[PDB]
Each structure stands twice: as structure tokens, then as C-alpha cells.
Design a protein around this motif. Structure first.
Motif, PDB file in Angstrom:
ATOM      1  N   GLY A  61       0.760  -1.235   0.000  1.00  0.00           N
ATOM      2  CA  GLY A  61       0.000   0.000   0.000  1.00  0.00           C
ATOM      3  C   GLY A  61       0.792   1.287   0.000  1.00  0.00           C
ATOM      4  O   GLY A  61       1.157   1.790   1.066  1.00  0.00           O
ATOM      5  N   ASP A  62       1.045   1.829  -1.182  1.00  0.00           N
ATOM      6  CA  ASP A  62       1.643   3.139  -1.392  1.00  0.00           C
ATOM      7  C   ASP A  62       1.312   3.646  -2.796  1.00  0.00           C
ATOM      8  O   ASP A  62       1.177   2.850  -3.728  1.00  0.00           O
ATOM      9  CB  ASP A  62       3.155   3.122  -1.180  1.00  0.00           C
ATOM     10  N   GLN A  63       1.178   4.960  -2.953  1.00  0.00           N
ATOM     11  CA  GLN A  63       0.879   5.532  -4.268  1.00  0.00           C
ATOM     12  C   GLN A  63       2.163   5.998  -4.956  1.00  0.00           C
ATOM     13  O   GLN A  63       2.963   6.721  -4.362  1.00  0.00           O
ATOM     14  CB  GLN A  63      -0.119   6.682  -4.161  1.00  0.00           C
ATOM     15  N   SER A  90      14.044  -3.809  -4.292  1.00  0.00           N
ATOM     16  CA  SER A  90      13.552  -2.436  -4.255  1.00  0.00           C
ATOM     17  C   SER A  90      12.133  -2.331  -3.705  1.00  0.00           C
ATOM     18  O   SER A  90      11.255  -3.117  -4.075  1.00  0.00           O
ATOM     19  CB  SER A  90      13.557  -1.801  -5.648  1.00  0.00           C
ATOM     20  N   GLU A  91      11.900  -1.334  -2.852  1.00  0.00           N
ATOM     21  CA  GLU A  91      10.552  -1.006  -2.393  1.00  0.00           C
ATOM     22  C   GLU A  91       9.526  -0.982  -3.517  1.00  0.00           C
ATOM     23  O   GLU A  91       8.362  -1.337  -3.313  1.00  0.00           O
ATOM     24  CB  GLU A  91      10.557   0.361  -1.706  1.00  0.00           C
ATOM     25  N   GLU A  92       9.936  -0.562  -4.711  1.00  0.00           N
ATOM     26  CA  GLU A  92       9.079  -0.444  -5.876  1.00  0.00           C
ATOM     27  C   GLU A  92       8.846  -1.759  -6.599  1.00  0.00           C
ATOM     28  O   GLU A  92       7.991  -1.834  -7.487  1.00  0.00           O
ATOM     29  CB  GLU A  92       9.688   0.571  -6.868  1.00  0.00           C
ATOM     30  N   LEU A 269       7.082   0.967   8.683  1.00  0.00           N
ATOM     31  CA  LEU A 269       8.308   0.976   7.894  1.00  0.00           C
ATOM     32  C   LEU A 269       8.768  -0.444   7.564  1.00  0.00           C
ATOM     33  O   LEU A 269       8.490  -1.393   8.297  1.00  0.00           O
ATOM     34  CB  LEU A 269       9.383   1.772   8.637  1.00  0.00           C
ATOM     35  N   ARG A 270       9.461  -0.561   6.443  1.00  0.00           N
ATOM     36  CA  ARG A 270       9.959  -1.789   5.848  1.00  0.00           C
ATOM     37  C   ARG A 270      11.322  -2.187   6.397  1.00  0.00           C
ATOM     38  O   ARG A 270      12.251  -1.383   6.464  1.00  0.00           O
ATOM     39  CB  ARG A 270      10.039  -1.616   4.331  1.00  0.00           C
ATOM     40  N   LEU A 271      11.423  -3.440   6.812  1.00  0.00           N
ATOM     41  CA  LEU A 271      12.612  -3.960   7.469  1.00  0.00           C
ATOM     42  C   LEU A 271      13.853  -3.955   6.581  1.00  0.00           C
ATOM     43  O   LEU A 271      14.935  -3.541   7.001  1.00  0.00           O
ATOM     44  CB  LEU A 271      12.333  -5.402   7.920  1.00  0.00           C
ATOM     45  N   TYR A 273      14.713  -2.371   3.624  1.00  0.00           N
ATOM     46  CA  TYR A 273      15.293  -1.210   2.955  1.00  0.00           C
ATOM     47  C   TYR A 273      14.931   0.089   3.664  1.00  0.00           C
ATOM     48  O   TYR A 273      15.245   1.164   3.150  1.00  0.00           O
ATOM     49  CB  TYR A 273      14.849  -1.160   1.488  1.00  0.00           C
ATOM     50  N   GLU A 274      14.290  -0.010   4.826  1.00  0.00           N
ATOM     51  CA  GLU A 274      14.066   1.175   5.664  1.00  0.00           C
ATOM     52  C   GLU A 274      14.644   0.924   7.043  1.00  0.00           C
ATOM     53  O   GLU A 274      15.599   1.585   7.454  1.00  0.00           O
ATOM     54  CB  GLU A 274      12.589   1.567   5.758  1.00  0.00           C
ATOM     55  N   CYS A 275      14.099  -0.049   7.791  1.00  0.00           N
ATOM     56  CA  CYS A 275      14.639  -0.202   9.152  1.00  0.00           C
ATOM     57  C   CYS A 275      16.057  -0.738   9.236  1.00  0.00           C
ATOM     58  O   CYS A 275      16.875  -0.188   9.992  1.00  0.00           O
ATOM     59  CB  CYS A 275      13.707  -1.115   9.964  1.00  0.00           C
TER      60      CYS A 275
HETATM   61 TL   LIG Z   1       7.003   1.931   1.967  1.00  0.00          TL
END
Ligand SMILES: [Tl+]
Ligand SMILES: O=P(O)(O)OC[C@H]1O[C@](O)(CO)[C@@H](O)[C@@H]1O
Ligand SMILES: O=P([O-])([O-])O
Ligand SMILES: [Mg+2]
Ligand SMILES: [Mg+2]
Ligand SMILES: [Tl+]
Ligand SMILES: [Tl+]
Ligand SMILES: [Tl+]
Length: 331
Positions: A61-63, A90-92, A269-271, A273-275
Motif C-alpha cells: 500500500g503506497d501511491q 527495491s521497495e518499488e 516501515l519496511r525492514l 530497505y528502511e529499518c
Molecule cells: Tl514503503
């Protein structure tokens, strides 16, 4: 003035005696190129009309903003062409990306090509987040290669597109900050061996979720506003872009929180590539990074887009919050 300690020299001299293929340097040089081109795009996004959405959704869930697409493409192409990677997360992208046999190197790179989506249109600080792992396995490269605990990180960091563009890089021996020189397009060392304060006086969290917070987070915030020992209350700060809030946490000290809440057991937050990258940075600078019940870097993921709660910053602040969670812990 005519001896510039660039990121490239730094990473190069670093792994000298401890030699190596040098594909890490190639890796990082490649990434720097993409960060410069993201920075240039962002500094002129309204003129170039790079604000708005691309018209797509991600995994949970992200735009999809136009800059997401642009920056994702950049980071992927330069990592691939670096000859230093085999698996990219990648998050994308729903699935991990496998680098073609000819261009493969030994690193796994987890990244968020552009983090801080909600802050893009209002010109607030945004950034790029990355975690780099060595592929241990000997079998054909695969998504499994990205499912390593943060403890296995060999390098992690972020580019902050703020009032200045900064590349913060953590490796086994420590954290160093490099600032982009817009005139010669080089990342230059401005902060060496950065260590976070043991205790800060800033707390950073979205209090808009007060209704969903667990009793531990609720008690902690109250304590920051009404200190029991009559010390000065903490100041609040929440830029809303993880890279910005964490960078301020690093150089000013204090605590940043995106905890689990009644509606989000695993936080937002994502483990991968973020956390993990920020956890790693935090811990190389002498800080801590916890879910409230366990160290972020020790979690063994099962989903590349897995979410984790994260509480990070000055050890004495993160620890005061750990004590509150321990105090509240039930059967
Ligand atoms: Tl995200
Ligand atoms: O609006 P919220 O829920 O505080 O989300 C803020 C967080 O979302 C993110 O954009 C990640 O999706 C982070 O950069 C930021 O810390
Ligand atoms: O979009 P993001 O990165 O999630 O903020
Ligand atoms: Mg993103
Ligand atoms: Mg993100
Ligand atoms: Tl996204
Ligand atoms: Tl974004
Ligand atoms: Tl996120």
C-alpha cells in the motif's frame, strides 16, 4: 582545496590493507552517480514537472509518485552496470531482481530509491535508503539471498536530499558523512567517525496515532512532556521523512519512533530497505535500534517487503523506552 577526500578515495583507502576485489568501491561509485541524478531532478522537480503520481500501486500500500519511478530506474541501472551485485531488492518491485549473469558481482542490495513520499510535493527533505549484503550462498542467486538479518549488513546508509545533499555511509568500522559538492559533482567527507550522543532531548514520532499507541509508547511520550524529576521537557520534531528524522537523530541525538500500534502489529516501515539500514547506521554510531522487544538487526526476515516496528537513537533514550516495554510486558 586541491586534495579532496571524496567518498571514492575514502572507501578505497579504507579497504586497502584489507584489500578485496574493490567491487564495493565500484558499487558505491555507481550508487553515488544515481544519487547525484536524483538530487538534480529533485532540486528542479516542479520545473521539470516531476511532482504528482505515476499511476500505480506497490506491494501492500503506497501511491507511486513520478519521482519514485525515475529514481528506481536510476538506482537499478547503475547497480546493475556496476558489476558488483547479483540480487536487488527495491521497495518499488514486488519481487527481487536478479542481475544477468554477465553483470553479476557478489553483493545483494536492498533499497528504497526515494523515501518520504508524503513530503515530496511540499518540498520537505526526502532521501534514498540502502542496505548492502554479501551473498553467502553458492547456489544460483535468488530472492532468498535478500532474506538476511541486518546483522549481516556489510554496508548501509542513505542520501539525504535536504537543504544540502548528504551521503551518510556506515561500514564495519563506523559512520562517515559525505556532502555533495554541486559544482564538481563529488561527495566530500565533512563528518568523520560520527557518534550519536548517549542521551538527547528531542523525541520524534507522529502523535496523530495517539489513539492506537501501546501503553508503553503512551507512557513514554507523557514522560517526555511531564518529566518526573522536573527536568526540562523534550522538544518535539517530526519531519515525516524517515531519512530526515533519523539524520537529525544522528547528529543531534534523541529518539525516533515508528512503533507497532493497535492497527499495525509490525509498524509501517519496511525492514529490508528502511529499518535495517538505519538500524545499522544507528548501531555503528553507538546508538540502539529496537522493535520495543528485540533488536532490529537480529530479526530474520521471511518477506522482502516485511514491515518492522522501529525505535532508534541515543542508547539511554532507547533504553528508557525498552524499560517501559519490559515493565508492561504480559504473558
Ligand atoms: Tl514503503
Ligand atoms: O505519515 P506517517 O504515518 O507518519 O509516515 C511517515 C513515514 O512514512 C515514510 O514515508 C515511509 O513510507 C517514512 O519516510 C516516514 O517516516
Ligand atoms: O514512499 P516511501 O519511501 O515509503 O516514503
Ligand atoms: Mg519509496
Ligand atoms: Mg519508503
Ligand atoms: Tl513507493
Ligand atoms: Tl517516495
Ligand atoms: Tl514505508
Amino acid at each position: 582545496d586541491t586534495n579532496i577526500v571524496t567518498l571514492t578515495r575514502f572507501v578505497m583507502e579504507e579497504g586497502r590493507k584489507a584489500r578485496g576485489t574493490g567491487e564495493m568501491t565500484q558499487l558505491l561509485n555507481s550508487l553515488c552517480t544515481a544519487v547525484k541524478a536524483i538530487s538534480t531532478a529533485v532540486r528542479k522537480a516542479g520545473i521539470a514537472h516531476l511532482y504528482g503520481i505515476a499511476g500505480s500501486t506497490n506491494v501492500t500500500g503506497d501511491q507511486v509518485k513520478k519521482l519514485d519511478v525515475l529514481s528506481n530506474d536510476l538506482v537499478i541501472n547503475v547497480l546493475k552496470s556496476s558489476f558488483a551485485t547479483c540480487v536487488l531488492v527495491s521497495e518499488e518491485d514486488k519481487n527481487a531482481i536478479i542481475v544477468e549473469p554477465e553483470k553479476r558481482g557478489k553483493y545483494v542490495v536492498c533499497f528504497d530509491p526515494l523515501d518520504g513520499s508524503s513530503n515530496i510535493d511540499c518540498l520537505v527533505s526526502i532521501g534514498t535508503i540502502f542496505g548492502i549484503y554479501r551473498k553467502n550462498s553458492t547456489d544460483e542467486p535468488s530472492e532468498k539471498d535478500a532474506l538476511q538479518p541486518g546483522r549481516n549488513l556489510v554496508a548501509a546508509g542513505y542520501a539525504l536530499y535536504g537543504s544540502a545533499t548528504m551521503l551518510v555511509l556506515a561500514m564495519v568500522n563506523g559512520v562517515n558523512c559525505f556532502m555533495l559538492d554541486p559544482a564538481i559533482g563529488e561527495f566530500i567527507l565533512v563528518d568523520r567517525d560520527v557518534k550519536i550522543k548517549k542521551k538527547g532531548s528531542i523525541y520524534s514520532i507522529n502523535e496523530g496515532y495517539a489513539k492506537e499507541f501501546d501503553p508503553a509508547i503512551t507512557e513514554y511520550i507523557q514522560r517526555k512532556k511531564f518529566p518526573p524529576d522536573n527536568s526540562a521537557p523534550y522538544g518535539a520534531r517530526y519531519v515525516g521523512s524517515m531519512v530526515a528524522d533519523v539524520h537529525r537523530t544522528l547528529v543531534y541525538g534523541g529518539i525516533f519512533m515508528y512503533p507497532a500500534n493497535k492497527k499495525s502489529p509490525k509498524g509501517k516501515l519496511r525492514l529490508l530497505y528502511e529499518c535495517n539500514p538505519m538500524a545499522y547506521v544507528m548501531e555503528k554510531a553507538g546508538g540502539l535500534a529496537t522493535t520495543g522487544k528485540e533488536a532490529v538487526l537480529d530479526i530474520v526476515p521471511t518477506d522482502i517487503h516485511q514491515r518492522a516496528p522501529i525505535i532508534l537513537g541515543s542508547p539511554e533514550d532507547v533504553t528508557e523506552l525498552l524499560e517501559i516495554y519490559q515493565k508492561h510486558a504480559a504473558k
